Amino acid sequence: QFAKPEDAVKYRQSALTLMASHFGRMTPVVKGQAPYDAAQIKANVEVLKTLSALPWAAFGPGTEGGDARPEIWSDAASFKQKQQAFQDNIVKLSAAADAGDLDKLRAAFGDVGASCKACHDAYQK
Amino acid sequence: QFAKPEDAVKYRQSALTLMASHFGRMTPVVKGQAPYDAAQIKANVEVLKTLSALPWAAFGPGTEGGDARPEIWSDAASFKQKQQAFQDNIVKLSAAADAGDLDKLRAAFGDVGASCKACHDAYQK
Ligand code: HEC
Ligand code: HEC
């Protein structure tokens, strides 16, 4: 869907920005600093679910650039495992949000955040 | 969800970028230049649906900035009608995509695009 490789870079950065907002905005809720409204969080995690599937198709072949480390493409398969692991952790977060259980949400949220960091540590400059 | 007003600006620009990609990538399909796969389009329009609800909450009070014209806030209510009209046109597009009818998709797509332009004409610098 990208006319030039920089279009893919702009798309993925935008997706990751939105992901970060939908993930990070829950931090005060998981910490108990903002109230826990189960319906609010369920809705938000549904948006995060959708968003969290979007960046990976914009690291296609030939889309080298941005703050991506070249190893996204030089070890594409390690990168792929890290995206699928992250998405699997999003499934656990969705289940916790659908259950309406703050303890489960806290645990899942930490799992998701660890998965973000693991990919950054290897693939972000 | 924004620590400072510029955070809202970055969020909305990112949402609108993603919206534009999910909308514009269908152009060759509606023009007949790329094949029409009803399941492909149905899935894509579901993503566009989700995305199309996201920018408006990031034009909150006090989030003046970006390439937004000041009138988004000085006539907030005209801006609001234009967002709700755009979202209503997204509903028609979703219905066309769910029906799997290329003629209906073409008509809805044109309706949506006209709604994008109508808002830009009044509110984008
Ligand atoms: C499987 C790999 C991977 C996962 C998982 C991942 N990221 Fe990243 N992230 C990247 C890469 C690669 C970049 C740099 C992209 C670029 O500049 O081309 C990035 C960039 C970003 C950016 C900056 C985008 C910009 O505007 O330039 C943010 C914000 C971000 N990530 C947040 C997150 C959050 C929050 C999570 C987890 C909820 C997450 N990421 C999970 C790989 C990942
Ligand atoms: C109800 C108003 C409204 C509608 C509807 C709307 N836009 Fe916009 N658009 C804006 C405003 C306001 C900006 C500038 C936002 C800013 O810079 O703060 C903008 C900016 C953009 C940008 C640039 C974002 C960036 O990276 O800075 C793109 C791309 C875009 N719009 C595409 C679209 C498409 C495609 C549609 C329809 C599918 C659409 N817009 C519908 C109001 C709207």
Side-chain angles (χ1 to χ4, degrees), chain A residues 2-9 11-68 70-79 81-83 85-100 102-116 118-124, chain B residues 2-9 11-68 70-79 81-83 85-100 102-116 118-124:
Chain A
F2 308 115
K4 295 164 163 197
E6 194 51 37
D7 293 313
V9 173
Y11 177 102
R12 70 206 188 208
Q13 286 179 345
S14 288
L16 291 161
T17 297
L18 300 167
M19 255 172 64
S21 178
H22 289 274
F23 180 72
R25 72 179 55 195
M26 303 185 284
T27 303
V29 178
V30 290
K31 295 185 168 156
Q33 294 158 7
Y36 176 51
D37 170 335
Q40 178 182 211
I41 291 302
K42 177 176 178 182
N44 184 65
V45 171
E46 290 168 341
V47 173
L48 178 56
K49 166 179 171 173
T50 297
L51 290 171
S52 282
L54 301 181
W56 317 114
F59 292 94
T63 68
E64 291 75 5
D67 271 323
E71 294 75 20
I72 292 168
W73 296 276
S74 63
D75 17 318
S78 176
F79 185 78
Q81 66 200 199
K82 291 192 201 296
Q83 71 91 340
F86 164 71
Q87 292 199 73
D88 291 343
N89 286 279
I90 292 294
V91 172
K92 182 172 179 300
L93 188 63
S94 296
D98 294 354
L102 182 52
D103 286 20
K104 299 173 185 280
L105 191 78
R106 286 185 345 126
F109 186 87
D111 293 343
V112 170
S115 194
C116 312
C119 186
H120 294 164
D121 280 350
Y123 299 110
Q124 185 188 56
Chain B
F2 308 115
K4 295 164 163 197
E6 194 51 37
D7 293 313
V9 173
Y11 177 102
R12 70 206 188 208
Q13 286 179 345
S14 288
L16 291 161
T17 297
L18 300 167
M19 255 172 64
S21 178
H22 289 274
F23 180 72
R25 72 179 55 195
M26 303 185 284
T27 303
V29 178
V30 290
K31 295 185 168 156
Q33 294 158 7
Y36 176 51
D37 170 335
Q40 178 182 211
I41 291 302
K42 177 176 178 182
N44 184 65
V45 171
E46 290 168 341
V47 173
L48 178 56
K49 166 179 171 173
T50 297
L51 290 171
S52 282
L54 301 181
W56 317 114
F59 292 94
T63 68
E64 291 75 5
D67 271 323
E71 294 75 20
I72 292 168
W73 296 276
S74 63
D75 17 318
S78 176
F79 185 78
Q81 66 200 199
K82 291 192 201 296
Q83 71 91 340
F86 164 71
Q87 292 199 73
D88 291 343
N89 286 279
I90 292 294
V91 172
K92 182 172 179 300
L93 188 63
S94 296
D98 294 354
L102 182 52
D103 286 20
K104 299 173 185 280
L105 191 78
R106 286 185 345 126
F109 186 87
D111 293 343
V112 170
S115 194
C116 312
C119 186
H120 294 164
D121 280 350
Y123 299 110
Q124 185 188 56

